[PDB]
């Protein structure tokens, strides 16, 4: 607040702490759905497409985690197979209009670097070992989200470049190149080569 | 040093007052401080009434530095303090030094006639 | 005074009624008015100025006080007896170590061993008068500082300098203190104070490898600080506490100082012009550590200047060539080498200003003085390789390159060695150009370097000096060839044609070339490995910002409580690097974020000694830039709180007094560099063109303006404290610059600045009693 | 030459009891002056305010209350006119940008910090655009002939032809720091010492070269010590900034080898490259308490590279401020001839204020005085304009004056 009001306003908002405490589903950050492709989305899991925050009724002083971007929920849903329509129903994507949704793009990049880390752990003790399954699902999911311009290719690639490097993540770079080959081979003729 | 308007206002006072400068407090850097007196058939209670006349006299009406330490411990002095303070409250803005002296005198007289 | 006497009589009568009674609150009220009157500074000052006019009533005051104290002390109260004790102390009112003497002694030991004792005695008497130090604790801090600095010294020549500093400079300091002030009883007390500290003395004895307290007590007996009976019972105590083939360095130094005097008096005359005797004596000198012992003794005892004059005059005598055959000139060239190499070693160790003549009537400045002036690298001196000093002729330099390409000289019978040494720079310049064009092979370069470094070693030093200047100017990729020249000039010995004393000249020359090349070989990572000898060199971390260095060293100096030698060297390099303003401002910031009384007082007692690196410039920054910025800024003066603020006011007044009453070579160079207009900096609405008078006048104008204004806050408490320690710290003058309106205003804001300043004449009481009015 | 206006503070001058500080001044491409002054009334933040004065409406002076705890050393506009770097003693480079595209509301979200070390030189990185003006083609009736781009390379190109934006600052220790602004809000910082021998840098300056190398000149004020030179190369190794320095040929200074009376002028007081992107010529200014010497030097090769002097003034008063031109003239021999014949002198002048009132507009190449303006108190900061027809200047009072040079 302003330095002249000070305590007079701040303590006031603190007395609205119990009301916000009434209107909070406890453990809402750690509750996760079971992803069904059926549609008819329950509106509990909808996030804000601008900032990945839960949409909150009122202007109360809610608990400090409810003002954070819910990346855990979105990463859990993107890691599941056939969670294509559910991510659109969460982030309000519509497919009649292309938008370049940025937080979706950053979450997809972080999913790729997480897959690269978990491939660089060993990937050789267990041949299947959930790694190549993850890379196949990453291929399918990322093809859809870059193809309809909900995310974009070159910002994704150069942000991916900024996350790698120094990290020294080199054992499964062939898989990452394969996924990029899926995008390029899918859409080289539609866009200019400078992309 | 001292502005000419203050000198003229002093020269044209009623002989009841014996205004003088103030070398006691920190002065000669800000405003002009005065301990004048009360000498008349009335009462000489608390003669100093320290008055700080700021520079550029035809503005920023002078303020009386309050001293409640001496005006207490006595009923008459408490009454004169109360009435003179109320009369300063009723005084119009941009008042002069002669106005404060006259309202001080008439407030003392009101305290005399009341008790 | 009469009302105080009546109040004392009221307490006496009421206490007598209390004794006869045993609610008697009359004693409580009487004592309350006693402490309420006497608690004010106005009233105690008024009673002190009332003292003078009415003598012998004070006697009755104190006798009534004594009877009062008896009758109250018999009938004690859980609260009133403490009150009566407090009021009695008030009517009568009408340690730790001393880190500053420690750090001043350790600073003078570390930086200028060669400084005169009078400056040190003046500074120590100053410090003793600022903070009022008893004489036994003062001399104890001197000895403790000396021994601690000896123990913490690195092995090598610094241990020699510290042994010479304790055993030869400090007794002369105590002698001049005995002159310039019952000293034997105090120094004996301080010696018993010291002899309690057995672990310090045993650590020192392990480094000394002898009883260095015995040598101290015999030395202070020789100087006359101590009586002989005191010396003998102190040595008895020390032996009793001690019970629970090579000579040590202290005996060598104490016997080597008379050899310094007698070597002066015998080599005035060139051993009656016998240069072979000179060669024998100087070859004994270059035998291990003997030169360093003589130099440490001569530096600690003030005779380094005469020693340098003697070797310089010997050098001038052996410059030219007498008509000779070979085994007389082969002696004369060796005399040139020994005198030159020892003069370079002196100038690299004890500074260059002992080599200077400081007045040469006539143009006949010697060869070594000009060579050192224009051609030798020092710490703050970087040289121009194409200065006109390095380009003497074209005639002689072709004769010299033909001379170096002839064979092993063979013509040393007449060389005029000053001309040769001045010409080597142009010679190796042409050699370098020949090698850069490729006309010269590497193998002929080896021949030329052998002809330089073989017969006479000073030629290698002159060539390496020019090479260091020339490599410092070059770029990165252009350097590669010229560094090889140093690798051949500073390489291991050329053999089988050496004149005499070759290995010792090689050892001294390797030291000189280390200290010449070190900076350039730091710029590019190049290891030459000439042969620790540079113990305090390259101290800063390579990448860390320099405030972290400053705050870490000041944190460690506070948590120890004294300033190390290494810490003194890093503080010097940071003062040279970040400048005075940055240094003083950051140390004062680190003061002002302390919250304890103990740590603030210790930090101030250390920071005075740290600022004694360049006291004068630090006072100009402190009273001119830091303090007006803290007093004028309205947001800043919350930092001027009670605990750090009193300490800061103390440090400012100590700095002002010590700068008024009135030191390192970097600081001398940098203040000679500095240009500033203090008349323009401080426009001001004795000389008054001396900048310190201008800063002091400006500061006192600021103080009067702060005291006179409204809005009293912490800054007003600061200027009150500043004026109070100006009063208390003075003997009598910094306060000559005070405006006379401050006399009026200071007792308008309250006291002691009147009652001390008046000097108490019968008319002086009238002005005193007048001042104590208003508030 | 002539005085257009003099803008003074009203009653807010008479700084008392606290000494003066050096001022900064920066004229942008859009005509906005950013400058600091020593107001010193009831606060020291009145010496930490950055005044923005639009030159068409000077009465309206905006005053950014910068949160700089020590005194502002350097101000620096962008290559455009849209951002302003400001750095003070004790680190803290702040990058002010406009708020809501108003020239009256500035706010900094981005900055660097090398704590405790005073910034002594500061520069934006070069974006590779450089054009040259051919005065002899003034009638040539096509703008491609008059103004032509000169194939300059930007330091740190990133994935395309596009330069990164960022700054490089040089501290009073040996430290240099580079901060690179991403197209996103991220900022990469790196500090590294200039050379291994860490030493005082009391004056410093930054130029750029073709090839994307920064060239930074350091001096320690002593005027008998060399003015050293370093080549800095920026890179983005992996994902972070990476600085590669290399020593260049240093120079000493004449008036020290004068040998008649060499001791005078013991302080180098201004070090300036002749223009940023003109890294081969250097203007130095040695000064005593009363007199001074400016000198121009050049790197020109034959030791391959070697600093040789071009010219020097005879003896002056003490130079209080120095302003170098910004108009990028083509500087070769035919254009010198035609600009001497047709008297075109906008890009060939430096302005030298002095400690008396006078101001000298002096030639670039051979420093002979072209004009003299007597003030009828000295200019503590000067700046020429981008077309170099007017120079702005802050005095040793509150006065800010704009002079027109014909």
């Amino acid at each position: 607040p302003h330095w002249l009001l000070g305590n007079l306003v701040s303590d006031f908002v603190d007395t609205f702490r119990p009301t916000a405490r009434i209107n909070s589903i406890c453990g809402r950050c750690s509750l996760l759905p079971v992803v069904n492709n059926s549609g008819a989305i329950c509106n509990s899991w909808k996030l804000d497409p601008a900032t990945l925050r839960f949409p909150l009724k009122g202007l109360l002083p809610y608990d400090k985690d409810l003002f954070e971007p819910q990346t855990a929920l979105l990463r859990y849903v993107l890691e599941q197979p056939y969670s294509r329509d559910m991510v659109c129903n969460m982030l309000g994507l519509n497919k009649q209009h292309k938008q370049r949704c940025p937080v979706l793009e950053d979450q997809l990049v972080d999913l790729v670097v997480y897959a690269m880390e978990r491939s660089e752990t060993e990937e050789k003790f267990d041949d299947g070992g959930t790694s190549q399954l993850l890379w196949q699902h990453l291929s399918s999911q990322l093809i859809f989200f870059v193809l309809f311009q909900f995310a974009s290719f070159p910002h994704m690639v150069l942000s991916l470049h900024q996350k790698l490097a120094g990290r020294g993540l080199i054992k499964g770079r062939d898989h990452l190149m394969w996924v990029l080959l899926q995008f390029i081979s899918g859409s080289i003729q539609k866009n200019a080569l400078a992309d | 040093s001292i502005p000419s308007v203050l000198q003229g206002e002093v020269a044209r006072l009623d002989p009841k007052f014996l205004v003088n400068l103030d070398p006691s407090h920190c002065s000669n850097n800000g405003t002009v401080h005065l301990i004048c007196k009360l000498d008349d058939k009335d009462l000489p209670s608390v003669p100093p009434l320290e008055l700080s006349v700021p520079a550029d006299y035809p503005a920023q009406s002078p303020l009386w530095i309050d001293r409640q330490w001496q005006y207490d411990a006595n009923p008459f002095l408490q009454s004169v303090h109360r009435c003179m303070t109320s009369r300063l409250l009723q005084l119009p803005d941009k008042h002069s030094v002669t106005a404060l002296l006259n309202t001080w005198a008439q407030s003392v007289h009101q305290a005399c006639l009341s008790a | 005074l009469s009302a105080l006497h009546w109040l004392l009589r009221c307490t006496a009568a009421s206490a007598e009624r209390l004794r006869e009674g045993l609610g008697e609150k009359q004693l409580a009220m009487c004592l309350q008015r006693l402490e309420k009157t006497l608690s004010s500074t106005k009233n105690r000052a008024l009673l002190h100025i009332a003292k003078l006019e009415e003598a012998s009533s004070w006697t009755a005051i104190e006798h009534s006080l004594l009877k009062l104290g008896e009758i109250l002390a018999n009938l004690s109260n859980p609260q009133l007896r403490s009150q009566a004790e407090q009021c009695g102390t008030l009517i009568r009112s009408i340690k730790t170590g001393f880190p500053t003497v420690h750090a001043v002694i350790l600073l003078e030991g570390t930086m200028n061993l060669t400084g005169e004792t009078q400056s040190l005695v003046e500074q120590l008497t100053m410090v003793k008068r600022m903070q009022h130090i008893p004489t036994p604790l003062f001399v104890l801090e001197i000895w403790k500082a000396c021994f601690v600095g000896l123990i913490e010294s690195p092995e090598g020549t610094e241990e020699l300098k510290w042994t010479a500093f304790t055993f030869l400079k400090i007794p002369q300091v105590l002698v001049k203190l005995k002159k310039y002030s019952d000293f034997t009883e105090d120094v004996n007390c301080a010696f018993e104070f010291l002899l309690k500290l057995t672990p310090l003395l045993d650590k020192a004895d392990q480094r000394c490898n002898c009883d260095c307290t015995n040598f101290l007590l015999q030395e202070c007996g020789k100087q006359g600080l101590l009586s002989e009976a005191s010396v003998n019972n102190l040595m008895a105590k020390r032996k009793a506490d001690r019970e629970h083939n090579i000579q040590p360095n202290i005996q060598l130094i104490l016997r080597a100082e008379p050899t310094v005097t007698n070597i002066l008096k015998t080599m005035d005359a060139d051993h009656s012009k016998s240069p072979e005797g000179l060669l024998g004596v100087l070859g004994h000198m270059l035998s291990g550590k003997s030169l360093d012992l003589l130099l440490a003794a001569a530096a600690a005892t003030g005779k380094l200047k005469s020693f340098a004059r003697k070797f310089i005059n010997l050098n001038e005598f052996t410059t030219y060539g007498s008509e000779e055959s070979t085994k007389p000139a082969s002696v004369r060239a060796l005399l040139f080498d020994i005198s030159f190499l020892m003069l370079c070693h002196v100038a690299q160790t004890y500074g260059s200003e002992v080599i200077l003549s400081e007045s040469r009537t006539g143009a006949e400045v010697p060869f070594f003085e000009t060579w050192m002036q224009t051609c030798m690298p020092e710490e703050g001196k970087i040289l121009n390789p194409d200065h006109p000093c390095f380009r003497p002729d074209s005639t002689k330099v072709e004769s010299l390159v033909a001379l170096l390409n002839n064979s092993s000289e063979m013509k040393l019978v007449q060389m005029k060695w000053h001309e040769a040494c001045l010409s080597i720079s142009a010679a190796i310049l042409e050699i370098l150009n020949a090698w850069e064009n490729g006309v010269l092979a590497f193998e002929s370069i080896q021949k030329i370097t052998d002809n330089i470094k073989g017969k006479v070693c000073s030629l290698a030093v002159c060539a390496v000096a020019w090479l260091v200047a020339h490599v410092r100017m070059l770029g990165l990729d252009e350097r590669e060839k010229s560094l090889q020249m140093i690798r051949q000039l500073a390489g291991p010995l050329f053999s089988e044609n050496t004149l005499q004393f070759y290995n010792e000249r090689v050892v001294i020359m390797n030291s000189i070339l280390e200290r010449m090349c070190a900076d350039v070989l730091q710029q590019t990572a190049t290891q030459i490995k000439f042969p620790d000898t540079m113990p305090y060199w390259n101290l800063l971390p390579p990448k860390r910002p320099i405030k972290e260095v400053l705050t870490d060293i000041f944190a460690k100096v506070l948590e120890k409580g004294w300033v190390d030698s290494r810490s003194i060297h890093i503080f010097d390099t940071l003062l040279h690097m970040g400048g005075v303003y940055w240094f003083c401002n950051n140390l004062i910031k680190e003061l002002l974020k302390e919250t304890r009384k103990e740590h603030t007082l210790r930090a101030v007692e250390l920071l005075y000694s740290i600022f004694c690196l360049d006291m004068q410039q630090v006072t100009l920054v402190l009273l001119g830039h830091i303090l007006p910025g803290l007093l004028t800024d309205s947001s800043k003066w919350h930092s001027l709180m009670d605990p750090p603020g009193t300490a800061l006011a103390k440090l400012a007044v100590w700095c002002a007094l010590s700068s008024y009453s009135s030191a390192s070579t970097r600081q001398k160079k940098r203040h000679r560099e500095d240009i500033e207009d203090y008349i323009s900096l401080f426009p001001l609405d004795v000389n008054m063109r001396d900048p310190l008078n201008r800063v002091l006048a400006n500061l006192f104008l600021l103080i009067s303006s702060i005291l006179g204004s409204r809005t009293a806050g912490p800054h007003t408490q600061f200027v009150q404290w500043f004026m109070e320690e100006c009063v208390d710290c003075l003997e009598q003058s910094v306060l000559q610059f005070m405006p006379f309106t401050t006399v009026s205003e200071l007792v308008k804001v309250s006291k002691v600045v009147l009652a001390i300043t008046d000097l108490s004449l019968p008319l002086g009481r009238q002005v005193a009693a007048k001042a104590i009015a208003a508030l | 030459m002539d005085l257009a206006y003099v803008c003074e503070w009203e009653k807010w001058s008479k700084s008392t009891h606290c000494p003066s500080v050096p001022l900064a001044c920066a004229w942008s491409c859009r005509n906005l002056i950013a400058f600091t002054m020593d107001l010193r009334s009831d606060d020291q933040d009145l010496t930490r305010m950055i005044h923005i004065l639009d030159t068409e409406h000077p009465w309206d002076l905006h005053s950014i209350p910068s949160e700089h705890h020590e005194a502002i050393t350097c101000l620096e506009w962008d290559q455009s006119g849209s951002r302003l770097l400001s750095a003070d003693a004790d680190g803290q480079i702040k990058c002010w940008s406009m708020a809501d595209h108003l020239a009256n509301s500035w706010e900094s979200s981005v900055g660097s910090l090398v704590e405790g070390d005073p910034i002594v030189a500061l520069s934006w990185l070069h974006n590779g655009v450089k054009l040259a003006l051919h005065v002899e083609k003034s009638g040539a009736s096509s703008f491609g002939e008059k103004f032509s781009r000169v194939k300059f390379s930007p330091s740190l190109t990133l994935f395309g032809g596009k330069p990164m934006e960022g700054w490089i600052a040089v501290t009073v220790s040996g430290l240099v720091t580079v901060s690179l602004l991403k197209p996103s809000g991220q900022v990469l910082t790196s500090t590294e010492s200039l050379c291994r021998l860490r030493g005082r840098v009391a004056l410093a300056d930054i130029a750029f070269t073709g090839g994307g190398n920064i060239v930074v000149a350091t001096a320690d004020g002593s005027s008998a010590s060399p003015v050293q030179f370093y080549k800095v190369c920026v890179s983005v190794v992996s994902e972070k900034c990476r600085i590669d320095t290399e020593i260049l040929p240093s120079l000493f200074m004449r008036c020290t080898t004068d040998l008649n009376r060499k001791d005078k002028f013991p302080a180098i007081t201004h070090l300036k490259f002749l223009a940023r992107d003109m890294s081969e010529q250097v203007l130095l200014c040695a000064s005593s308490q009363t007199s001074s010497i400016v000198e121009c030097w050049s790197l020109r090769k034959e030791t391959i590279l070697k600093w040789r002097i071009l010219s020097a003034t005879n003896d002056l008063d003490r130079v209080s401020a120095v302003a170098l031109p910004k108009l990028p003239i083509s500087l070769t021999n035919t254009d010198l001839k035609v600009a001497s014949d047709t008297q075109f002198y906008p890009g060939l002048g430096l302005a030298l204020a002095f400690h008396d009132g006078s101001v000298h507009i002096v030639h670039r190449l051979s420093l002979q005085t072209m004009a003299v303006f007597y003030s009828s108190v000295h200019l503590k900061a000067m700046q020429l304009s981008w077309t170099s027809l007017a120079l702005v200047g802050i005095d040793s009072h509150g006065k800010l004056s704009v002079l027109r040079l014909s």
Side-chain angles (χ1 to χ4, degrees), chain C residues 541 544 548 577 582 633-634, chain D residues 42-43 115-116 198 200 250:
Chain C
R544 283 211 311 161
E548 297 182 348
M577 183 169 288
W582 170 89
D633 195 346
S634 299
Chain D
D42 304 336
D43 202 311
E115 67 280 351
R198 193 161 167 182
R200 179 158 166 78
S250 73

Side-chain angles (χ1 to χ4, degrees), chain C residues 487 521 524-530:
Chain C
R487 296 276 192 89
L521 314 181
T524 52
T526 55
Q527 286 205 1
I528 288 194
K529 314 148 248 79
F530 306 79

Side-chain angles (χ1 to χ4, degrees), chain C residues 534-548:
Chain C
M534 289 195 306
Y536 308 124
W537 173 82
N538 198 43
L539 281 174
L540 305 186
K543 202 204 291 318
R544 283 211 311 161
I546 205 63
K547 198 210 186 185
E548 297 182 348

Side-chain angles (χ1 to χ4, degrees), chain D residues 40-171:
Chain D
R40 194 73 267 212
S41 316
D42 304 336
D43 202 311
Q44 188 72 307
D45 184 85
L46 274 299
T47 48
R48 315 297 155 75
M49 289 173 87
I50 299 171
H51 306 122
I52 306 283
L53 177 140
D54 168 74
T55 320
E56 190 53 63
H57 312 297
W59 36 87
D60 282 330
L61 180 139
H62 186 247
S63 290
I64 319 173
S66 75
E67 282 88 8
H68 275 159
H69 296 321
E70 313 280 355
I72 313 181
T73 301
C74 280
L75 263 71
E76 208 88 20
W77 285 101
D78 210 348
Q79 283 85 16
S80 90
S82 156
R83 303 196 191 101
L84 174 71
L85 270 191
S86 68
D88 51 340
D90 297 62
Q92 197 71 72
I93 317 166
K94 293 187 130 168
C95 177
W96 307 95
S97 86
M98 282 154 170
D100 319 329
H101 310 278
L102 301 169
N104 272 340
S105 298
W106 297 82
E107 52 91 20
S108 82
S109 44
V110 188
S112 175
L113 188 144
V114 183
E115 67 280 351
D117 255 343
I119 296 297
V120 80
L122 177 66
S123 160
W124 286 90
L125 280 183
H126 202 260
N127 54 345
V129 49
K130 179 191 156 75
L131 73 162
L133 278 80
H134 313 308
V135 54
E136 56 97 16
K137 302 198 253 182
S138 42
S141 70
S142 171
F143 287 165
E145 310 173 54
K146 311 201 209 199
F147 327 114
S148 44
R149 302 170 50 91
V150 212
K151 190 64 179 174
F152 204 87
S153 43
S155 42
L156 204 58
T157 81
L158 250 291
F159 215 95
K162 296 290 106 181
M164 291 189 76
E165 277 295 298
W167 51 87
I168 170 162
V170 169
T171 60

Side-chain angles (χ1 to χ4, degrees), chain C residues 383-384 436 473 476-477 519 522 541 544 546 548 576-577 582 585 589 624 628 632-634 675 681 698, chain D residues 17 19-20 40 42-44 70 115-117 196-198 200 221 246-247 250 252 257 287-288 303 318:
Chain C
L383 293 163
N384 207 359
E436 80 181 271
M473 288 280 271
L476 172 70
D477 301 7
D519 49 355
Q522 179 63 258
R544 283 211 311 161
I546 205 63
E548 297 182 348
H576 165 263
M577 183 169 288
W582 170 89
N585 182 34
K589 267 196 216 174
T632 317
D633 195 346
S634 299
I675 51 166
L681 281 176
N698 168 52
Chain D
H17 311 321
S20 44
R40 194 73 267 212
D42 304 336
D43 202 311
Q44 188 72 307
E70 313 280 355
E115 67 280 351
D117 255 343
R196 274 80 176 270
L197 190 149
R198 193 161 167 182
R200 179 158 166 78
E246 158 167 352
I247 313 108
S250 73
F252 266 81
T257 65
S287 166
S288 68
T303 72
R318 187 175 170 191

Side-chain angles (χ1 to χ4, degrees), chain C residues 29 42 65-66 105 184 186 192 285 302 363 372 392 399 474 497 559 565 628 659 704 707 732:
Chain C
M29 294 301 107
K42 284 176 65 67
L65 200 153
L66 287 187
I105 288 294
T184 306
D186 298 337
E192 283 201 325
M285 275 205 194
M372 175 265 310
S399 74
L474 286 194
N497 300 289
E559 272 187 28
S565 317
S659 44
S704 81
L707 283 180
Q732 294 189 21

